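FAQ: What does a ligand-bound record look like?

Like this one, built around zinc ion:
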Amino acid sequence: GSSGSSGPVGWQCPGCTFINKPTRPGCEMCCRARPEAYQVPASYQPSGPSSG
Ligand SMILES: [Zn+2]
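The answer part, i.e. the structure of the complex:
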């Protein structure tokens, strides 16, 4: 495969290669379901704001 290809986050749509957030199991462009094969880093958050 590719040596050191971490790149940006999110799973690249297996159809439109649309780097979709690691929290969105679906696509936005071709709304093509997320490829189960892919792997998401458990214990992940949308990085929401805090401190009111
Ligand atoms: Zn897509």
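Follow-up question: can I read anything off the structure? Yes, for example: The pocket of zinc ion is lined by residues 13, 15-16, 18, 27, 29-30, 32 (CB under 6 Å).
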